[PDB]
Amino acid sequence: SFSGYLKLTDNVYIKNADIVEEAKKVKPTVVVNAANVYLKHGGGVAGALNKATNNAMQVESDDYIATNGPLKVGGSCVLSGHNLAKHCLHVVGPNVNKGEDIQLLKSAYENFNQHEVLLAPLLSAGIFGADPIHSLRVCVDTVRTNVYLAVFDKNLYDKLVSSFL
C-alpha cells in the first residue's frame, strides 16, 4: 500500500514521485490519468502511463472514443488500469493553454469522489498550463475521498508543501 506520503489534510496526501513508478509499486485500485477529451495519451502523465501499458491503454481508449465520442472537459471515464492499477480513472482537467475555463478544475476533481481511494496527479498542472498551487487548493477543497498525490517535479513538490495553507 501507499508509503512515504506527507499528510496535508484528513484525506489528501502528497509525495514527490513518478506516478508510473508509484502505480507499478502499489498497484492501486484506481490510478488517475491526466486525460484530454479525446483520450489521446501523447505526453505528460497520459503519455507516461500509456507507454507503461505498452500502448494497451491507448488501444482501449480509441475503442472507448469510437463507441462513446469524446469526454467533456471536467468529465471522466473508468477504464482498465492494465498492469498499473485495477482501474484507470481518465479525468479531463481544463487545459488553459487551449483557453479552457479554469473553473472546470473543480468539476474535474469532483470525479475523484466516486472512488474511495486514488493515486493521482495534480489536475490541469504541468503541460495543461494551470498553476499547480491552485490545483492543489482545489483538490483539498473538493475531494472528500482518500487521494494520494504523486508530484513528479521535486522543486514543485517542495514549493507545494512549503506554501500549503
Q: For binding to ligand W0P (CB under 6 A), which residues are involved?
A: 121-122, 125-126, 132, 151-153, 156
Cell numbers given for 103: 473553473
Beta bridge pairs of residue 80: 87
Question: CB of 161: closest distance to ligand W0P in angstroms?
Answer: 12
DSSP H stretches of helix in 3-153:
19-26, 44-52, 56-68, 104-110, 132-142
107 versus 135: smaller Cβ distance to ligand W0P: 135
46 versus 125: smaller Cβ distance to ligand W0P: 125
Distance CA 136, CA 70 (A): 26
56 versus 96: smaller Cβ distance to ligand W0P: 96
Angle at 139 between CA 158 and CA 121, to 5 degrees: 60
Residue 155: its H or E element: helix 154-163
Question: CB of 48: closest distance to ligand W0P in angstroms?
Answer: 10
Question: CB of 83: closest distance to ligand W0P in angstroms?
Answer: 21
Question: CB of 121: closest distance to ligand W0P in angstroms?
Answer: 5
4 versus 66: smaller Cβ distance to ligand W0P: 4
